[PDB]
Amino acid sequence: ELAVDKMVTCIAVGLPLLLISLAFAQEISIGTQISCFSPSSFSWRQAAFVDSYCWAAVQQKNSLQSESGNLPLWLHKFFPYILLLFAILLYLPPLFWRFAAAPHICSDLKFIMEELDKVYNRAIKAAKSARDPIVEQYLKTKKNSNNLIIKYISCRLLTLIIILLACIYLGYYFSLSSLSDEFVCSIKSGILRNDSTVPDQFQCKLIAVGIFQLLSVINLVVYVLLAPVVVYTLFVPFRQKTDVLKVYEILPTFDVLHFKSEGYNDLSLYNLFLEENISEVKSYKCLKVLENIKSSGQGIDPMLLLTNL
Amino acid sequence: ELAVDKMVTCIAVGLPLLLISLAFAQEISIGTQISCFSPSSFSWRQAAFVDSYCWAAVQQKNSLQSESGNLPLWLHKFFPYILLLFAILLYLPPLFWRFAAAPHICSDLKFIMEELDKVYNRAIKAAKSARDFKYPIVEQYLKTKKNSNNLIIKYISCRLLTLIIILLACIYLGYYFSLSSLSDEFVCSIKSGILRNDSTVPDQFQCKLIAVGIFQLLSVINLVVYVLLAPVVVYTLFVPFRQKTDVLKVYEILPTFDVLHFKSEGYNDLSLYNLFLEENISEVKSYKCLKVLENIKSSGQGIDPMLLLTNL
Amino acid sequence: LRLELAVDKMVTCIAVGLPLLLISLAFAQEISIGTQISCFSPSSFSWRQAAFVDSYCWAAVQQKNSLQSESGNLPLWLHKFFPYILLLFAILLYLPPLFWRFAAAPHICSDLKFIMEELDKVYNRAIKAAKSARDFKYPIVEQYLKTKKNSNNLIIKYISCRLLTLIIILLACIYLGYYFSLSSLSDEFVCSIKSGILRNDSTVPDQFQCKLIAVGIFQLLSVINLVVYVLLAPVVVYTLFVPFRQKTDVLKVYEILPTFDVLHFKSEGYNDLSLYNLFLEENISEVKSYKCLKVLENIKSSGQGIDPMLLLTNL
Amino acid sequence: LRLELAVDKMVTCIAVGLPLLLISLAFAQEISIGTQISCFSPSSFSWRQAAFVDSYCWAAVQQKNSLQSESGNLPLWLHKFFPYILLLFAILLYLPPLFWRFAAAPHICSDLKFIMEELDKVYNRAIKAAKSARDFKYPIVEQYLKTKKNSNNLIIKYISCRLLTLIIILLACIYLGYYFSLSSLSDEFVCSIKSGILRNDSTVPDQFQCKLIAVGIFQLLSVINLVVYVLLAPVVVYTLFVPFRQKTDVLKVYEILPTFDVLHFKSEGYNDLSLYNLFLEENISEVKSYKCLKVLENIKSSGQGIDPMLLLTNL
Amino acid sequence: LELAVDKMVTCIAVGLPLLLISLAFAQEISIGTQISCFSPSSFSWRQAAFVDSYCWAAVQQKNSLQSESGNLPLWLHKFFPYILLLFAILLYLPPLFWRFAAAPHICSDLKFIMEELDKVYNRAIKAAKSARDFKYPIVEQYLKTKKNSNNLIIKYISCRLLTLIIILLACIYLGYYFSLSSLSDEFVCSIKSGILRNDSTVPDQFQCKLIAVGIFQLLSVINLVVYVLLAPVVVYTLFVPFRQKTDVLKVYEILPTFDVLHFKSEGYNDLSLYNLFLEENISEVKSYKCLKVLENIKSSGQGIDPMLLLTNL
Amino acid sequence: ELAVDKMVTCIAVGLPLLLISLAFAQEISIGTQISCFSPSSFSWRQAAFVDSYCWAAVQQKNSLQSESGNLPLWLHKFFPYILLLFAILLYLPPLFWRFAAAPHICSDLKFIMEELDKVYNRAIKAAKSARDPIVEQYLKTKKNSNNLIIKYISCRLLTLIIILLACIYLGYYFSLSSLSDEFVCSIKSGILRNDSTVPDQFQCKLIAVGIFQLLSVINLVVYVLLAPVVVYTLFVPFRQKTDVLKVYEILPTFDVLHFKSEGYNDLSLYNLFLEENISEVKSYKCLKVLENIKSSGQGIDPMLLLTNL
């Protein structure tokens, strides 16, 4: 998993979870999520009934009358589970990737690294004997099929789509007349309908809403900062730079051909993954040492290769 | 476990669990699950008795009178347990197939990969000796694999039970999801036993099952995800349709390997083995090199045995 | 392969764990009294009516129309969101290290392990040549050293994570200094539950005297965090100027080997070579050849014997 | 490779775990009665009004205008911040051992392992020369130790961490002696909830008698911490006197080897040589050659045979 | 590195006060608060809570509370839990020697003795094998030296003596708690300092009772019983010489390459401590095992010493 | 630790702990351990005082008057800890066994297994060359000293004694009337003595005592089922059988002598531990393959041994 992809996943998933836990934590909360102000004559349990009834009655549109509407009321209860839903949906593409995409790119990349080590060993053995292109074709093939890279850009595109949907939802959540939690509630269905001791309507207010909006704007800011990162990561061809196989062109047992650029094809994705995992390849490390020395141009490539051993 | 099967299991199991855990958020729950509105004269403990009695009385059909019926009350009080039951039943087929079916296919697949590497080595050794037995054992093994569907029958059986349980969960959630939205309100009467002819206690109490609305909003989410998941299982259910890009066709260019794919068209274990080979074949080095030669053959510049000898 | 300089590890540990420890302290059971707000409803108000007043005013520190405070609504916002701010700073300060932990490591750890292996190899070859005398030759790692200064991209990542750490630490210092500068009377605000149907109600009084509790603890902890952070910022800066911290040339001890060219060539640049010099100075104690060579170099201070002979004796 | 002297490890363990253990005891499920403050509102006050009075006065130990105490506002501040002061001392006392282990530890180990290897090698060479008689020559370790004497920087990190430990222990002793030197009546303060709209209110009494509970436990634990710390301070001071502790010259047993020069040359300095002498005296029992040489040296007390003969017999 | 009897004495003397602390405050035995004061009926809930907490904090202020037994019994109950942990810590401190790196002081020398014994056994059987086809008693001289310095054994008997002293002090303290009547929890309390002094609605004095003190005494007697059972074990363990019998070396005397001398007994010196540690760790020594096999066979006398040695091979 | 000893320890220790944890289950426990029923005129805090006073007054014999006596009251409150005390005392002998005796038998058993593998290797090497008793004396010695086995039977005997004492205590406690949890308590010492608003006596009842008795009978049943197991384990000689070294008698390099039976000596204990840990010995496994075969007569012992390789 590319470092930028790992960090995008970590942010887009842990941020909604951390924000839920912020508001979610009991210490942060003052108490219940709703308070309704029953009359003074009401007993403790009658007031508890009013609170719980109105909490359950934000759904039943007939009971509650709110200036903003019933949708803002339903939105508040939705948000604790809505952020977790966004976290899960944002975790899904990385899960699909590791489960399916890595297995295909992992085998190919391990084979390419083994073949590169083998060609390096054979080149130095030929050079050592003097002192005394399967991988290229595979990569040429990799250019023909974009399907392996299509899994990657598809998981990235779903990540971007879900991030944009979360940004859209967060923006609607961020701007709220906050008067919705102040919407009235009437416990007058059933036998309580014509009852007289119970007042006609109660002034309820949704607890911990302001915290939800302050956290939703934070999530929206982080997500609109993250979306350009995904879009840049979405474009695989642009990120393919510092041609990694160019360092291998100084080997006799290796054909003089990079042939890795310019396409929305799996070859560019493999170039990125090679640029990432190539530091594990010892032969690449030694070849890059020789290539950097070649900047001065003092000695010669085959001599330093043989001498380096 | 195939990636699509692993993700279907992860969804179908974790979604009901995640939804259970959400339905009881330390911020979505206002408090108790039921509230009954005792009279003002009732003390705190008398009101607590009314609440707890009616909570326990959603079962006793004689005590409570509800317009929708007692079945909605049962469903509103046993909403969690049912989701956990669905999660467990959906986890059972992945547990079953993994425990017994997996190793059977693992041994066979490892043997097939070893035999393919061996035939590749022998073919290049024969070619190398030319530059300087012969029994298709794996082909015969795969020909046999076609005869018995039993290994694949375990797979399609676990997938079919997964689909059946997913459809039953969809039915329950659609039924439960499509509620009256007044059922959560039931009239309850604490008048059995010595309280029957008591006078200070009113005839009936107006109870409401709080946080039911959350149950329905989560049940519709579960139903949507499950009716999105069911086509995936049905597609995964059909093993023959999934298989393509004949993997052994790349081996047909070897002299030590008979020219025969012979892997298609059946509800038999051969198609399942074809899928698992298509998945795990990238680990096979000989397959990788042979596919390199096969892709080069698209241009048709050189020749298969020459490039193979040059492959070393 | 720690892949984190000790000073960087301790700066991360402090800058991250201190806000977390302070959050956990601000709500220790002995420290807190109960709710975060108390509003003093009238005596006629029932228990639940007083609970409504408390919760309403807690939620009403946001709605500017309801509450009237002498200091303003901004202190009220800052007092309610005390805990949230502390965690965010911890995460942002832990964010740079996470990037360094995953993105930065492949570029450096691999290079440093290769350099250590090459140094051990050149030491072995030098003593083998000396042993054969008692009875190729390409400076590959030195050629490697030139590349370090050449490409500053590897160094760029390090100074960038350090610079973001410094920027976030300075922003945290600014916020904590502002928060600690709060009035300490601004936690008392007048709140009025008179919106909606309660507006023209008469039994409810016009306004309630609410006080935000656990704010003095927040300020006392914010000043502690600010002190520790303004002590930490020079360490990060000190850290930012790597060219200055690259000292005690580590490869100079290897110059006494015949199989090693006589050239340090590691100094004076905002390039990856200085960063590699720091990481070599840190992780070089694991290199056995470096340890023995430093033993010989320290002995050479007296100048009694000779470098190649001493090496032969060590074998 | 412990890199922590047993006396230093125990001083750290005590000075750090004792304030933590005492914090954990001060709030045992059996020592806290409940809230940290109780204010005795009038009987007419409701439950929530009394809770408001308690929380207000708790937050009002800071606002000097509200509360009137005979001892002053400083005792009130010190009583409210009681547990924070101990965790801070625990952390500050843990800091020097952390600085020691993080950087100083690795440097000390390599040198000691090299010295032990060189001593085993010189012993082997001496017995091989003696064995050949029964049938180079450079004092490298002696020169290395002679060098160790030249640089006091190595013996300065250690005495600096010990000196900071002693300074923090003395500051903790001063604070705990002051805190225990409490009036024990200063936990009772008069508090008045009469700011804001409550100022001219009449139903609320003029002042409340609040008491800061669980203070007596704090003082009883502070005196325990002070006693243990004033018992620990002489231990740190003795640890500080590093040359005085360098005794029973460990290399003196090696002077009976022909392949080893007849020179101890390890004493009398605030230099890294004395620290290395201590660490050698500690870790030298692992050295087999030292064990056998000490066997011969103890036998030499009787003086029956001879040193080289005995060595040959041991083989 | 810690004798089994010492390990069990430490385990008991440390875990028993901790287990008893944890039991004293179990939910099943604690009814609730540790003090209850019985305010008048007119007092509100919070006023009664104030009375309880005030008297809890007032067991220290001697002016406020009047108790028949005195203020010391009152102070004892509050500090009783702390004492239980203080005694556990002080009893863990001497074992701290084992916790600290003092192993080399004894074990490193032991490891050398075991290696030297294996070497002398190998050399003896090699000489016997060559017969079938130097010579310096270095370990014997080392043990002879070990006799000269008692200092290593002085660390051991010092940690054991501090363990015994702390155990006896704990027995004395716990004995006292059991002895006390404990009506102490029934001592009166008066919340009449400050502005409450001349107040009239508050009664003159409250009858407070200290909760969980009977549990404290019942657990203190258990701790005292276990500790007075443990003290003889420490005293016996204190006497290292009386703790040594059937020395391991007496089996090596049948080797030609080993001098015929045990020379290990009768002293308050490090040699006796090394004898104990050798008797413990000697079963790991293979040469000792085979030599003890031959020595046990020699009880019958059927097989020759050197012959059986060579025969075993 | 022998499997039967490990299971006896596990039961005898975890059962009182599990029962303690059950006796105080959230569903199981209703609340406080005592309730006293103060008059209705008493305030909340006065009733709390009565409860706590009587809880502390089950000790002071003058205050409370109970029909069964003060001893049942003491046992009521102290029953929960008493189970932990029994668990600890039952854990003590297995703990002593681990340090005091387990290493002594471990070193000897490891040496015996090594010597058996060595004698097997030497026997097959002699047989292989043809195709081309130290351990016995040690065991003979083991017979002479019972001291190692005396540690084992001593820890088992203390386990049995503590189990029997626990059975006695639990049978007594379960034999309580179950009305002894109701005691009359009088808060009339001190200044309350001549007070008039406080009633003369309160009817207190000890909470969770029926649960204690129902759990004590379970513990007693399990313990009287466990005691015969310990008694059988107590008799080491009656347990040893299937002479394990008899399979080694078919080796030329091994003397033809079992010599392991009939004694209250450490040899029988070593026989048990060998019978347990001997399956780890490869030479024993092969000899048992062929040892059994020799009895059958299908093949000769030395030939099959040489063929075993």
Ligand SMILES: CC1(C)[C@@H](OC(=O)CCC(=O)O)CC[C@]2(C)[C@H]3C(=O)C=C4[C@@H]5C[C@@](C)(C(=O)O)CC[C@]5(C)CC[C@@]4(C)[C@]3(C)CC[C@@H]12
């Ligand atoms: C803590 C809770 C909320 C509750 O606590 C729990 O349910 C357990 C969960 C938890 O504690 O967190 C238990 C009930 C209770 C302890 C409750 C009580 O007992 C009796 C009264 C009285 C009722 C009244 C007005 C009358 O009846 O006339 C007389 C005045 C008085 C004292 C007012 C306050 C309450 C209502 C009082 C003290 C408020 C606190 C309350």
